[PDB]
Design a protein around this ligand. Structure first.
Ligand SMILES: NC(=O)C1=CN([C@@H]2O[C@H](COP(=O)(O)OP(=O)(O)OC[C@H]3O[C@@H](n4cnc5c(N)ncnc54)[C@H](OP(=O)(O)O)[C@@H]3O)[C@@H](O)[C@H]2O)C=CC1
Ligand SMILES: NC(=O)C1=CN([C@@H]2O[C@H](COP(=O)(O)OP(=O)(O)OC[C@H]3O[C@@H](n4cnc5c(N)ncnc54)[C@H](OP(=O)(O)O)[C@@H]3O)[C@@H](O)[C@H]2O)C=CC1
Ligand SMILES: Nc1nc2c(ncn2[C@@H]2O[C@H](COP(=O)(O)OP(=O)(O)O)[C@@H](O)[C@H]2O)c(=O)[nH]1
Ligand SMILES: Nc1nc2c(ncn2[C@@H]2O[C@H](COP(=O)(O)OP(=O)(O)O)[C@@H](O)[C@H]2O)c(=O)[nH]1
Lengths: 353, 354
């Protein structure tokens, strides 16, 4: 349905997901792709989004802009992670409607779901129970975004489509040890632990943008990482699914080509909980993932789990019957995704950290 | 009693039912630095206008009484509008109140935040614990997000953003538009116009509805199955809920602003979780009980009929008020007196919202 010459806007194109969607549409030869850096268009400025949408009137919108961070950043920035994401999504979704966009893809998150939802989690569990405390700010932004799509679809006849991915990983992520989500954090922690263990001082200098090992050792000691051990957060017991960034990009494009409002009414004629879960593969513990990374990248040191730090939800699995029956499948297995991310990590000179 | 007579006090939505009652009380009590703007003067849906206003006026206390709302049938149509307009108004006001170092803000919420199957009487801790009433979802989502935004600002920034969750309100200054009004003003206005028609008070009907002749008045009212013999209301009349008079809400808002701060909310929950305060007075009444009481008070001679072919929604709502009761708040106005005060105002007022 998206034509080669359709005006396609990718919001948050510099991010993990947005960069993968933009790269794929560029590779696949789409002719009319529009995007703006945060510097060029601040999506927290109501009038700037109004002006952009009125000038450009994109036919398709992939909403990939967000301000997020891992568990510890979420426990600090309670106001910021509600506020910034509420306004960005509300201005983009509203102006996409006011300027007669054909379809919009809203990216949501598993934190919409109740902590004690029956497993595997069904899309119909949204708003049926108490949230995970850690995630409440972002969860409330995402629930509100999901419901906003439903209400625009119902009142205005829009095609505002929601995909709810599991935790994502791959090239282009935020690997800042303090602010990263679990997968990029533990990958970056184990990788730096490996360079230290193997006395690869120059790679550590180049990777961390530091000049001497006193500064490297001091930076890494903050995370209880030394030449012998890499310490990770919590018990390592929480279990969840992971999905490779290029599979999410593929699913977003697939959904934008193939789903409309009329198809959502087959799930619920009032658009109630008509988002689609997006997941691939089994659940893994954080400890299993850590040990898999350690094997793949050849780390010889110890992985210790500092159980003095928080775990939240101990088990997440996702019902993916809606998107499976629509015909989507993942291409990238966890071992291959780790290898692709490692290959990229070894060569990228502008890593987010 | 911590707002001073000279405190800079902003009442957002000052022309509405709650806002007008708070402004009138503070004017009458001699507060000297009251700040307010009409919707025309300050559109709270414009981010930059809200920023400009807060930067200029730097209010110390904010009463957030602005909203775009409507009864059950308007809510079933305006799914997008009732989320969008309220989400952006509250987000801009709460954020700019933080950015401009307000002392305290009072956020008004609504019982639709609660699960349809919440255990009764409803406790504040039931918010986000279960499925909402479908009819109310758009406004309910705006209100849940507002309640949570006050919690998050309180936790991250040490603000004093305080939330009251009133039951259905009634009184002078309401929206009495027969199609868009909430249940209490709707049934009052329907019964009152039914009374005038039953009593052949054609001139009062022309004055009230701004129509020229009885044919026009009869066409308009026949939309609601109101005629010279009877008044038709929506549903079975069996749904039950609490009602609170507008001036009791105004008094509770002022009491809350004088008496609660963040330190006090932490006594309910150290992380501000579900630390809004329910606001209710009195027993649950059926819509039929309120309709019959209005009939009795205004002396309507006609029949009241409940059109069962229309929706009832949630069948019973009662509220746990232990928090606000332990703080020392009490309602002053009983239902019969509130109806009489509303009727007295209705028979005088030249600019009723209809
Ligand atoms: N990563 C994951 O594990 C998961 C992600 N998702 C969802 O996918 C979406 C994309 O996430 P992800 O790609 O990981 O996020 P990223 O942090 O990688 O990317 C965020 C993007 O938003 C941009 N942005 C942030 N603030 C603004 C602003 N004020 N104006 C304009 N642009 C802005 C960032 O640019 P800049 O950096 O220059 O500010 C960047 O382009 C989100 O909705 C997220 O919740 C869902 C499931 C899991
Ligand atoms: N009434 C009830 O039964 C209940 C009310 N509450 C809550 O109390 C609060 C006040 O409700 P209530 O007094 O009944 O509401 P009203 O509809 O009576 O008043 C709404 C006010 O907001 C103003 N307003 C609307 N849109 C804008 C805008 N874009 N910019 C600026 N001002 C605007 C209106 O002005 P104008 O008319 O000129 O547009 C008016 O001053 C709400 O949060 C409501 O949910 C809670 C419990 C029940
Ligand atoms: N952010 C992060 N989480 C980690 C790390 N090591 C383990 N975890 C665990 O992963 C979970 C947090 O995941 P994260 O992506 O931060 O947050 P979430 O997706 O919102 O749950 C917690 O159990 C942490 O204890 C790490 O280095 N960083
Ligand atoms: N709006 C309205 N509701 C009515 C009327 N008569 C009865 N009701 C009942 O009042 C309830 C709707 O209340 P309303 O204030 O519109 O919405 P809510 O407070 O969001 O539930 C339902 O139980 C209706 O059946 C009427 O004339 N108008």
């Amino acid at each position: 349905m998206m034509n080669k010459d359709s005006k396609i806007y990718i919001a948050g194109h510099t991010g993990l997901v947005g960069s993968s969607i933009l790269k794929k549409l560029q590779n696949d030869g789409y002719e009319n792709l529009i995007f703006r850096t945060h510097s060029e268009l601040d999506l927290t400025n109501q009038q700037a989004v109004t002006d952009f949408f009125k000038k450009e009137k994109p036919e398709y919108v992939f909403f990939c802009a967000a301000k997020m961070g891992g568990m510890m950043e979420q426990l600090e920035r309670r106001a910021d992670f509600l506020y910034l994401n509420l306004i960005m999504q509300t201005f983009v979704l509203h102006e996409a409607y006011k300027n007669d966009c054909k379809k919009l893809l809203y990216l949501s998150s598993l934190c919409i779901y109740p902590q004690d939802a029956s497993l595997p989690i069904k899309e119909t569990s949204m708003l049926e129970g108490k949230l995970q405390f850690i995630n409440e700010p972002y969860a409330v932004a995402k629930i509100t975004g999901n419901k906003m799509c439903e209400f625009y679809n119902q009142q205005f006849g829009t095609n505002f489509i929601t995909l709810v991915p599991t935790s994502i990983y791959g090239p282009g992520d935020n690997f800042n040890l303090a602010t990263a989500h679990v997968f990029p954090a533990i990958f970056a922690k184990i990788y730096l632990g490996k360079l230290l263990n193997e006395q690869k001082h120059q790679e550590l200098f180049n990777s961390l943008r530091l000049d001497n090992i006193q500064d490297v050792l001091k930076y890494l000691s903050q995370f209880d990482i030394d030449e012998n051990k890499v310490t990770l957060l919590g018990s390592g017991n929480p279990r969840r699914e992971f999905i490779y960034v290029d599979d999410v990009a593929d699913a977003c494009i697939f959904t934008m080509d193939k789903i409309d409002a009329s198809m959502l009414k087959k799930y619920d004629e009032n658009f109630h909980n008509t988002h689609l879960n997006l997941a691939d593969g089994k659940d893994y513990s954080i400890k299993e993932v850590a040990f898999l990374i350690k094997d793949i990248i050849g780390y010889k040191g110890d992985i210790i789990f500092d159980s003095s730090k928080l775990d939240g939800t101990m088990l997440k699995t996702t019902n993916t019957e809606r998107i499976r029956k629509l015909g989507w499948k993942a291409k990238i297995k966890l071992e291959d995704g780790i290898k692709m991310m490692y290959e990229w990590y070894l060569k990228e000179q502008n890593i987010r950290q």
